[PDB]
Amino acid sequence: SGEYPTVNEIPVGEVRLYQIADGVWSHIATQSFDGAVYPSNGLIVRDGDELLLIDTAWGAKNTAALLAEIEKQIGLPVTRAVSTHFHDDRVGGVDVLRAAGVATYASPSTRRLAEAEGNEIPTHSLEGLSSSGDAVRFGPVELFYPGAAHSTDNLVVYVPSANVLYGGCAVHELSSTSAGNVADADLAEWPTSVERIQKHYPEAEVVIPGHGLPGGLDLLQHTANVVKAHKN
């Protein structure tokens, strides 16, 4: 009923959208992994009379449900998608998207890692993002590679029209107490990567984590803090 939707409020298989700003929504879905249930966020950005999608809804059937929810609530076609790292909460559902006419994109790093892991593989490579601090335009967003954090390939997305920073899994929600799933992470570089984000997007008004509740710029410092303390 208007609050940001949380894990116990979304059955697995259903997707909710949340209006962030004019022409910007998050998408929220839930999935089982290793016997526990988790929420996950992505982004939708209006691109004229089309939509740009950031990240799948974590699975084939969740992603089909995402497309249906978008048609119900927004009614414009998703034409392109970007996956912000190689994990299943970002690429699982890419095959569904491709079969629905969506052109799927990711960095070459992400594509390699997805292929090696046996995850779904976006079709098109995003060049120009291989060095930390790199940025490229993609429709109504800027894609930014901050350096290794949650994963070596993680990208962040900025919506300049709305000052919305989508951190993906490199950014945690304020209630976080732990670095999350860190098997592919670089705990030593993660604070430095977050500091790059802080420096590059000082006007961000909304910060959206990969999982959990959006907030403001404090999510960035909080993330750095949690990661440093976890490593320690």
Ligand X SMILES: C[C@H](NC(=O)c1ccc(CN)cc1)c1cccc2c(-c3ccc(CN4CCOCC4)nc3)c(C(=O)O)[nH]c12
Task: Report the SS3 class of residue 27.
Answer: strand
Question: Residues 27, 150, 172, 222: which is the catalytic one?
Answer: 150
Rounded CA-CA distance 37/30 in Å is 7
Closest to 114 (Cα-Cα) out of 147, 91, 131, 93:
91
Binders of ligand X among residues 32 to 51 (CB under 6 A) are 33, 38
Q: Interacting stretch for ligand X, rule CB under 6 A, among 85-93, 125-133, 213-221, 222-230?
A: 85-93
Q: What is the DSSP string of 119-153?
A: ----SEE--S-SSTT-EEEETTEEEE---SSSSTT
For ligand X, the binding residue among 16, 27, 80, 87 (CB under 6 A) is 87
Binders of Zn ion among residues 102 to 161 (CB under 5 A) are none
Residue stretches of the annotated binding site: 85, 87, 89, 125, 127, 150, 169, 211
Residue stretches of the annotated binding site for Zn(2+): 85, 87, 89, 125, 127, 150, 169, 211
For Zn ion, the binding residue among 102, 169, 208, 227 (CB under 5 A) is 169
Question: Residues 95, 134, 181, 230: which is the catalytic one?
Answer: 181
**Residue 87 near Zn ion by CB under 5 A:** yes
Alpha helices (runs of H) in 19-167, residue ranges in sequence order: 60-73, 88-91, 94-99, 108-117
181 is catalytic: yes
85 is catalytic: yes
For ligand X, the binding residue among 145, 184, 190, 220 (CB under 6 A) is 184
Rounded CA-CA distance 187/183 in Å is 10
DSSP helix, strand, coil percent of the chain (3-state; round to 5): 25, 30, 45
Alpha-carbon distances of 117 from 89, 92, 96, rounded to whole Å: 13, 12, 19
Q: Interacting stretch for ligand X, rule CB under 6 A, among 73-81, 87-95, 105-113, 123-131?
A: 87-95
Binders of ligand X among residues 140 to 179 (CB under 6 A) are 150, 169
Least CB distance to ligand X at residue 135 (A): 22
Rounded CA-CA distance 85/169 in Å is 8
Q: Which residues pair with 155 in a beta bridge?
A: none
For ligand X, the binding residue among 93, 167, 210, 215 (CB under 6 A) is 210
For ligand X, the binding residue among 181, 192, 198, 225 (CB under 6 A) is 181
Q: How many residues lie near Zn ion (CB under 5 A)?
A: 4
Rounded CA-CA distance 16/76 in Å is 16
**Residue 88 near ligand X by CB under 6 A:** yes
**Residue 89 near ligand X by CB under 6 A:** yes
Rounded CA-CA distance 189/153 in Å is 13
Binding residues vs ligand X (CB under 6 A): 33, 38, 87-89, 150, 169, 180-181, 183-184, 210-211
